[PDB]
Subunit: 121 residues, 4 copies
Amino acid sequence: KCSLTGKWTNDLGSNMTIGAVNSRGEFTGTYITAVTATSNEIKESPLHGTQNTINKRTQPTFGFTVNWKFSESTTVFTGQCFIDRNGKEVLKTMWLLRSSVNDIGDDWKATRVGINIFTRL
Amino acid sequence: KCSLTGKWTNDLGSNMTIGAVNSRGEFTGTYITAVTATSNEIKESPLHGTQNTINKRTQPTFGFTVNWKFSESTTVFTGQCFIDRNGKEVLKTMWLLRSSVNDIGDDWKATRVGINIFTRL
Amino acid sequence: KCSLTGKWTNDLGSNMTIGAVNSRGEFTGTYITAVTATSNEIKESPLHGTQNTINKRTQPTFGFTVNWKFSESTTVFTGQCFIDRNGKEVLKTMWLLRSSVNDIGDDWKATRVGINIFTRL
Amino acid sequence: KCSLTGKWTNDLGSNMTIGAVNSRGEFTGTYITAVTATSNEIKESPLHGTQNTINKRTQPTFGFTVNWKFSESTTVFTGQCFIDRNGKEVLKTMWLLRSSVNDIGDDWKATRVGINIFTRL
Ligand SMILES: *[C@@H]1O[C@H](CO)[C@@H](O[C@@H]2O[C@H](CO)[C@@H](O)[C@H](O)[C@H]2NC(C)=O)[C@H](O)[C@H]1NC(C)=O
Ligand SMILES: *[C@@H]1O[C@H](CO)[C@@H](O[C@@H]2O[C@H](CO)[C@@H](O)[C@H](O)[C@H]2NC(C)=O)[C@H](O)[C@H]1NC(C)=O
Ligand SMILES: *[C@@H]1O[C@H](CO)[C@@H](O[C@@H]2O[C@H](CO)[C@@H](O)[C@H](O)[C@H]2NC(C)=O)[C@H](O)[C@H]1NC(C)=O
Ligand SMILES: *[C@@H]1O[C@H](CO)[C@@H](O[C@@H]2O[C@H](CO)[C@@H](O)[C@H](O)[C@H]2NC(C)=O)[C@H](O)[C@H]1NC(C)=O
Ligand SMILES: CC1(C)CC(NC(=O)CCCCC[C@@H]2SC[C@@H]3NC(=O)N[C@@H]32)CC(C)(C)N1O
Ligand SMILES: CC1(C)CC(NC(=O)CCCCC[C@@H]2SC[C@@H]3NC(=O)N[C@@H]32)CC(C)(C)N1O
Ligand SMILES: CC1(C)CC(NC(=O)CCCCC[C@@H]2SC[C@@H]3NC(=O)N[C@@H]32)CC(C)(C)N1O
Ligand SMILES: CC1(C)CC(NC(=O)CCCCC[C@@H]2SC[C@@H]3NC(=O)N[C@@H]32)CC(C)(C)N1O
């Protein structure tokens, strides 16, 4: 099975624990990033997301928001669960990192984009 | 004030109602998209997200996930609330749309990106 | 007609002059950005791109690279030319801004994404 | 050295040959994609780009446009050359794929985003 519940780790070394997914596809969890651009100490951050429940797909899409507890930014992840050739689950995700800008004129430079690959711990 | 709670509409005509934001910055709501690539009839979809609570910023960043009830995809929004020159609130967001792909080999083509500007209704 | 040749201006106030498009769809030009995150003075920068010519579409897709002459970054634009409801040409583009990072470990944070809308001057 | 000139292959199996980079940082080449969403047979496609020449960086940023000869879309790549721990050259790139849409109302769904990692052949 390819279930979001459990512990995950991505290619950067970030930790991710996801709790039970309810009948509506909602789940919470904690995110421990290995990499930060801030000068603050990294701290465990809550994550909230949902997984698509249409058709009850064996590899449903999902998204979640990480509310960083040491930064003023927000990252959103979206991706899908895959059972690779071997039979091990993989989460392929793309993310957007939103920085805080003091002016709406600086908004053009506030969004970063990137990918992450999560495997089970 | 620039508060996510209330009704919003974006440049595509999509509706968005966000409920109260709790002390942890979590909020739920419903999303009614005006535009769909599916052949299904559009339907109101739940959204879940959080807004950054670090520093009590008057224009905090936020992210939320839309779990489409008529599609098998997931969209994640991230952006910031702005009080423009006049004094009207604006949400500047970028989003990722994740489609469902049956194979991990098709994963490269599953993510769309775009922007939305939300104003109060 | 919706031809890339000529002068353009986007929602940020950036200037853009595109030269003739050759039979292979290649074109050069200059880009004058109104907004910069650097402390350097902005300077006119060359751009190089091509436009798709597969079906001689009235609104072909295109892409080009801006090689900033005052920054160490690179921006790539991709979009399409549209003849809007009125009859005025519009270029709808999305871009990626690549910053220079000293280490491959910092590569995750080096890419920005955003949109631009160009109208004729 | 980390020079764009030569042959490259990415994680999808796509081929890439880049010619000499001139004093202005311009280069051409051909791109052979392993993966296509079209029903057409894949064909070698020209690419045009430039690499940043500011500061004579040993790992300068670059961008290029692929003008697909079998599709009506355009892909733009932007990234940086890295000399990894061992001594291998790696191109870390993000790309935007622009599809052709008949109407400006469909423009919201026309852009895909993704990453590619290129190693020397
Ligand atoms: C992600 O989770 C893994 C699994 O626990 C963490 O790896 C362990 O980290 C501790 C920290 O001292 C080490 O003592 C263990 O030996 C590590 N185990 C393995 C198997 O590597 C990892 O630290 C977590 N990532 C982050 C950023 O906290
Ligand atoms: C977004 O919300 C607005 C505000 O209610 C909707 O606009 C109304 O739509 C109804 C539908 O028949 C019309 O009767 C009203 O005249 C509209 N009011 C205004 C001020 O335009 C709009 O339909 C919503 N968008 C979607 C996609 O449902
Ligand atoms: C983009 O092009 C426009 C058109 O020339 C520029 O607007 C002019 O800028 C000069 C600069 O002093 C003014 O004197 C003119 O009055 C402006 N004309 C209009 C119609 O606004 C604009 O400056 C260019 N953008 C950048 C960033 O250089
Ligand atoms: C990318 O380049 C490599 C290197 O030539 C190609 O790999 C060869 O493909 C031919 C095709 O029949 C095989 O006969 C060789 O055995 C392959 N060599 C290796 C080392 O794998 C590859 O085909 C190219 N990719 C694409 C999409 O054409
Ligand atoms: C603007 C920038 C570059 C980013 C901001 N910093 C942060 O957002 C740190 C919070 C942790 C982000 C972890 C991302 S999230 C996606 C990816 N996947 C993963 O595991 N880690 C990364 C603010 C400052 C100003 C410091 N800097 O400069
Ligand atoms: C693959 C593609 C193109 C997309 C998929 N369709 C959907 O995801 C429809 C669900 C509503 C999305 C609304 C987006 S969300 C961001 C933006 N902002 C806004 O208001 N609307 C848009 C699946 C199919 C196969 C049908 N097609 O083909
Ligand atoms: C990392 C960051 C934020 C960006 C880098 N700066 C630059 O890239 C300036 C070069 C001009 C870019 C213009 C973009 S391009 C797309 C968009 N459309 C438009 O017209 N303008 C904008 C480097 C530094 C470190 C200074 N900062 O910090
Ligand atoms: C809309 C969509 C999904 C895409 C369009 N197809 C193409 O653009 C095929 C041209 C080759 C693209 C190769 C990309 S480029 C970045 C990445 N890196 C790599 O090596 N390959 C991939 C049109 C149609 C309608 C067919 N489909 O549906």
